[PDB]
From a paper:
[name]-53 transports certain subsets of newly synthesized secretory proteins and membrane proteins from the endoplasmic reticulum to the Golgi apparatus. [name] is a small protein composed of an EF-hand domain with two Ca2+ binding sites, and functions as a binding partner of [name]-53 in a Ca2+-dependent manner. From the amino acid sequence, [name]-53 is predicted to be a single-pass transmembrane protein that consists of a luminal carbohydrate recognition domain (CRD), a long stalk domain, a transmembrane (TM) helix and a short cytoplasmic tail (CT). Here we present cryo-EM structures of full-length [name]-53 in complex with its functional partner [name]. These structures reveal that [name]-53 exists as a homotetramer, not a homohexamer as previously suggested, and comprises a four-leaf clover-like head and a long stalk composed of three sets of four-helix coiled-coil followed by a transmembrane domain.
The two different structures of the head region suggest its conformational variability. In component IIhead, two CRD dimers rotate along a vertical axis (i.e., nearly parallel to the central coiled-coil) in opposite directions (referred to as twisting motion) (right). In the superposition of substate structures C and D, S-H1 and [name] in the upper layers and those in the lower layers rotate by 2.5˚ and 1.9˚, respectively, breaking the C2 symmetry of the head region. These rotations seem to be ascribed to the flexible loops between the CRD and S-H1 and between S-H1 and S-H2. Thus, the two loops within the head region likely generate the plasticity of the head region, allowing the CRD-[name] complex to fluctuate continuously in the tetrameric structure.
Numbering used by the authors:
A (entry chain E), C (entry chain A): 42 to 367
B (entry chain F), D (entry chain B): 42 to 312, 324 to 365
E (entry chain C), F (entry chain H), G (entry chain G), H (entry chain D): 40 to 102, 108 to 144
The structure:
Amino acid sequence: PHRRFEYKYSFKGPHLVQSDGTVPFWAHAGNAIPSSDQIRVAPSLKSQRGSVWTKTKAAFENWEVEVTFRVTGRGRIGADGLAIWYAENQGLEGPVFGSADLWNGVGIFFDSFDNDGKKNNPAIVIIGNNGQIHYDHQNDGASQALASCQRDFRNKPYPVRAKITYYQNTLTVMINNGFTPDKNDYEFCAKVENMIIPAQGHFGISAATGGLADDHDVLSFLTFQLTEPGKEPPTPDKEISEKEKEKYQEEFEHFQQELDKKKEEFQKGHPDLQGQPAEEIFESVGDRELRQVFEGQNRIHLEIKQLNRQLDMILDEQRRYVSSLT
Amino acid sequence: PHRRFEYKYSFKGPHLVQSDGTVPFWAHAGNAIPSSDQIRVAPSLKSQRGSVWTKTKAAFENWEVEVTFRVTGRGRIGADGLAIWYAENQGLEGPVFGSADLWNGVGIFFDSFDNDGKKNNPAIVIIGNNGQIHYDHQNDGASQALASCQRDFRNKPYPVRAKITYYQNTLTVMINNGFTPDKNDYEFCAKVENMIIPAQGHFGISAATGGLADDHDVLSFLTFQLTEPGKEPPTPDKEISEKEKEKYQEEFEHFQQELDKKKEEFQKGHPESVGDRELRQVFEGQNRIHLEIKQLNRQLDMILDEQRRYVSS
Amino acid sequence: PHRRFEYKYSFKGPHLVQSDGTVPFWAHAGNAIPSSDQIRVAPSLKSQRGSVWTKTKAAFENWEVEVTFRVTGRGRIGADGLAIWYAENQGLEGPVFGSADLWNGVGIFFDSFDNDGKKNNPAIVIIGNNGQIHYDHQNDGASQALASCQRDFRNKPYPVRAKITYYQNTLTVMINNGFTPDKNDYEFCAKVENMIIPAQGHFGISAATGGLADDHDVLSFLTFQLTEPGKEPPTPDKEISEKEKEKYQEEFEHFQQELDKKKEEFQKGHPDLQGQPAEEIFESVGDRELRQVFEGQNRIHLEIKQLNRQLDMILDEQRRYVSSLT
Amino acid sequence: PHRRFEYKYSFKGPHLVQSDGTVPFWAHAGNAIPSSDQIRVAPSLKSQRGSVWTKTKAAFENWEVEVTFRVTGRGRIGADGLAIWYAENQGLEGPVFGSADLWNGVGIFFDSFDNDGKKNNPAIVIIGNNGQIHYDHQNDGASQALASCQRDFRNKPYPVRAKITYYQNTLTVMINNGFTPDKNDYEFCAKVENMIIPAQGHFGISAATGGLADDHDVLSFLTFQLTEPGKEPPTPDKEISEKEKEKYQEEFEHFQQELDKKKEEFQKGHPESVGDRELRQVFEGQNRIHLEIKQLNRQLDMILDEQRRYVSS
Amino acid sequence: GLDKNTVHDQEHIMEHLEGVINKPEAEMSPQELQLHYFKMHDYDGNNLLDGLELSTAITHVHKQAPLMSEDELINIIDGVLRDDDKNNDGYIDYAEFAKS
Amino acid sequence: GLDKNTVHDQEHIMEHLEGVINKPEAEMSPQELQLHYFKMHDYDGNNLLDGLELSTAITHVHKQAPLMSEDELINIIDGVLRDDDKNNDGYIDYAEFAKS
Amino acid sequence: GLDKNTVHDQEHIMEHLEGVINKPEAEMSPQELQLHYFKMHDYDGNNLLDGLELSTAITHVHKQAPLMSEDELINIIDGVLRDDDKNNDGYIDYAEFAKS
Amino acid sequence: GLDKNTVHDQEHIMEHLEGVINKPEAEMSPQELQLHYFKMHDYDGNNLLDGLELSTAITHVHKQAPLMSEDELINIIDGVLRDDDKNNDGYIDYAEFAKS
Ligand SMILES: [Ca+2]
Ligand SMILES: [Ca+2]
Ligand SMILES: [Ca+2]
Ligand SMILES: [Ca+2]
Ligand SMILES: [Ca+2]
Ligand SMILES: [Ca+2]
Ligand SMILES: [Ca+2]
Ligand SMILES: [Ca+2]
Ligand SMILES: [Ca+2]
Ligand SMILES: [Ca+2]
Ligand SMILES: [Ca+2]
Ligand SMILES: [Ca+2]
Ligand SMILES: [Ca+2]
Ligand SMILES: [Ca+2]
Ligand SMILES: [Ca+2]
Ligand SMILES: [Ca+2]
Ligand SMILES: [Zn+2]
Ligand SMILES: [Zn+2]
Ligand SMILES: [Zn+2]
Ligand SMILES: [Zn+2]
């Protein structure tokens, strides 16, 4: 298909916010803490709710959404999770993932807590609703689950990238598992066929936190309008010629390759600039616990060292006490 | 020494924040996010600064503060760290651990990033200041460090407890390493003798975040006024007789036992996990080994001083 | 649909073998070790290959297969995994999960080792083949994967039950995750639409082990022929009447309820019979490691106790030595 | 003593089995499944029995066997356990740990299931039968136990090493608990003094599995003939001079160093994990603590015997 | 091949009930012992008989005898399923079993 | 402000005990409900009351109403500490609490 | 609103290149500085400009000034995309950017 | 049976070093290959050879041929131990191995 990047329904780093402190073309509410790098929709405190929705409604028949996010928890269990909504009204505050219930649209829930007790979480659940069906909060929407693939998105070394595409009344969710820094490494998760959604509606994201607590960051949100090749108006008159393209792109490439060498000798010329790897950032929960045990053993080692040294001291004190008498 | 819990300069859970959304008797500024059970002074976002100070100034000559906190980072490197201030004016926003520079008072910095590059971090640094010398941010206050320490307080399984005591112009910082859930398990960290501080000032805490990012949560902050046994004047005949206390406490304990039995049949009448319990057992076993070795050290010291007096004879 | 249980293509306990030592109507080869309760297709030794196939070919157009199996590993990484085949030629030995390559049929692979390094394992991969395509062993059949759902089947507290249904050229794989003792608790895994398979062929199972090792047990294998309600001739004239059914089933129920009470007083009458729970059988890898560390601390505890006893002994020895002089 | 390794009564990896499929100089029977690196005497299926015995009989008066094995179970309860026999006839199949009853020799049983119900299992039991004692299977040989022990050898992170030594009519069993990868880290388990055994007999091992299931792998089995320094006759002038040894060993070490450097550039020229390394570090720290406490015990014993001689004066 | 006299055997039923239930009875009705047969041979617990359970029932090991060939076993069980099982489910119920 | 009638309130104690205690009692002695008040409002579990716990006890939402000013709460808690607490420890004990 | 003189500003480009590259030049060609502008404002690294990068390019913070309203920002960016972007991809390439 | 020509075999050493060592050499001194043989066939890494390691060295498949009888292997290993090993330790050292 043909994709057009729509800026009015998108936000990306590293200038996500403005001097005012709000996201352009987006309204945030709840415990959302928008920053230049990312938006923390729900922080790691108890009973947090946050949501970021679009201001103007999006009128698309075929669209594609690329959501980059992180869910980092200290424990091995998350609380509620992320939710990506294409609805008719701005949900804002509510009891479903920090968003209002009884929505008229589609929602992809990244559930990370097993309310039902079926040991099938974390999982991705696509739920459509017409606005009069209550969401089953206590059962993770098992009855309403149109398609439910199972994947782990918590505590991953790289941001999890998901792609939700509505095309010919078919919703395809393809989820990068966040194990590799490569962008275009998407893996299929789920699809729903013949689903009716409102023609125009708001794009939103939301998150919530229950007893346990996770950090629910969203790094970027991208929206692409999709059109069929046959239904795409050609209008090739605007394109002038290929001669100007050939006259321009090679000087662009030459400028890039010259600027690389221009930066090369001053990257190392000034030693103030320093790098930093992204490997020590990631550490598993079990690895952290084992490192904690190993760190705790050092007190025992040092105390035993002190005991041994004191015993050596009393031994030498008895050593010097023998020859004094005779 | 005698200790009196001053409530006006303290906060604790689980009702830390009110319905209004502010900490009682405490003014917060910056990126501090007070919650029901803890105050996140600085979250794990980039370039965050937060501080919580007292409203009224505290006039004490001998005081003690017990701060329970957590510094949790995804990586192995901390961002900036915590800071506990006893100052003359409310710093609020600023460039020194999320608080203003040129402060008139004492500050205990829990530095978690090695700006100096000496591989001596994370560390606890006590700095006194009269308000005329700038803090050395790029060298972790090496020149201004009246007394230093070397403890790791990041990613600990249990909240790290610190106790800071100003007594007879001596400031003693004793820090629990956060390996045991016991409260009164403090280990000596640092001390400063003959330090002059303002007689009255504000108690505050603050945190900041640099390139890397940590979460600096503060669970409790308890302030006790300290007085000497001889200096405190007694008040005879004001207290009640011990007979009434003996009459009362027996019925109190009987009622609490009866309430336990009343709760027993409704806990199960109306309806931790594996793995976490094993790790808790591992940590308890390590603590038991540590206590047993400490007892062995005490016994060896006892036999050493027993033999000490046997030499001069 | 209508299901008919076909015994010639099935094996169950607790009499899975005979006095001869072979599975009836099934031929096993490789390192398979058939027992009276399960078949260990590949044991926990290095470089094991095993396969169990049917003797006669099965001529079905719509069928259902229920496979109950266990994959138990000491470590956290599997060896190769199981493979369930519906191929027209028996492969007794080979390099693909202990079975021959270039098969003419369908194969459901329970891959438990990530050859590709994509960190997407263990996963269930459905692969069809027409006998001229080799298996991408080094990439877990990523290119040939018709449908690949992700589930964990290793070290589960209960046997993993899987159900593969071929019906109207649609292959549906529904996998019980092995977390609950309930039998009918199947959860959907994958489906493949419009796949052509040979009309008649052999049902088989196989397993293999690499440098790392797992135990690959198979507890049961059930085959059901599936027929459409309209295609199956009812022929109700062969049945006698419902009167005999009403005359028989109540005496069957009465005999059952009488035999229960008959066994009740002699279950406790003879105290030689003893029970055993199935909870201590299951233990996670991290839980086992933490238990191993806790067990290791007991040596240090005992040694410190011995040290304290010796120090008390020398203290008392110095205690009695003082008053002797004076 | 002087220990001569006897290859005819031994097996080890990583080439334990041959192309034929049988253990060299050893006959296996039952459900034993020899492999390239280990021999699974009994797998974790229901009612398994296996044994591996020697073909030829060994005629030694003082001997030593070093057995490395693993007993791994999914559950917390063992099936039957291992058994190491020095008998007169090959037991092969039987009802006693997968070996025949009424044996004329000694048998060391690593019982892992408490048939007696005394909660004293898993335990090591040395039994010397002389041909008319039926092993008390329902009581774990409590009456026949010449000497017992109490060790856990199941689900250990490392292989369990045992050393059984017959020397001067005394049988000493020293068992590594399997917490450290070090080979020579044996701890005393049991001993029997003045026990009569046949002069020549077969060395064997066997295992059995009940309703509960365990895997009984055997990684190695090494037999050493023992002789006294005074009893062994020397052979003067047969050995070569030390000058040739000094000439040879220097070039051997130089060549192995050069081979290390040769392997260095092709290890990375032509192309453990996290978490497991942390667990290994934890176990190494535990072993270091154990060794330091043992050194402390040695030093305390030294000062105790120093004060022992100071009393009589 | 599952004859009328084969199921009507008191000794085989008494041997099977030995150990599991300690109630040795003298004489029982033919329907009672056939109920015992049907309940005892249903190893799975579904109150149903099938080819795999009938294979255990026919090729049986008591306490020598040569093992039956696979072809004879297949023919016997196929004949039994074709004769008794009328609902074409593959399983044999007690209502279907009581006919013979 | 911690009055005699405020502590002796059956409906307030019943509301606080709702959920945790599934035993609705009819009538209780004044010391009984005052013991329930003291036990419920001690969150830290040290059998002691302090300024923060008293502030939580007085200024809590229940089930709209405007919040009390901080100066009034400071005055009330200071008066309570000056009146009841005689040991000058900062904490309020049931021995000191039984006076009022 | 992305005028010819707006991109043709040596001081803004010199301020942006400060720090990242320590090469302060005296005078550069208009095409050279517009190449610097296009390369610098491409925050992501795709060698493309879009609405989100042009928003940060227009609403800019140097070292006071009032912030531009959202409607004016939307109108300016929509006009720029309608004028320059001819392939209807949503992104703006250097070939499309060199027209104005 | 551990002959002088069997140890001094360049092709056998090259085959054993294939894969592990990516350095095909042309010609080597007899002591050099014999050192490579001794180092390669010591699997335990104790710088010692024994009857088991010698049996693996002699009877290995390579790339059909019938396996040697066990009695011949026993005789060969016994002869080697009686000839070379003088310390009666059971192990074969390079000091003892250098004789042949
Ligand atoms: Ca949920
Ligand atoms: Ca669920
Ligand atoms: Ca610092
Ligand atoms: Ca430093
Ligand atoms: Ca694989
Ligand atoms: Ca893979
Ligand atoms: Ca036993
Ligand atoms: Ca016992
Ligand atoms: Ca049945
Ligand atoms: Ca039927
Ligand atoms: Ca309290
Ligand atoms: Ca008090
Ligand atoms: Ca761009
Ligand atoms: Ca474009
Ligand atoms: Ca060796
Ligand atoms: Ca030697
Ligand atoms: Zn029978
Ligand atoms: Zn209330
Ligand atoms: Zn600028
Ligand atoms: Zn070779």
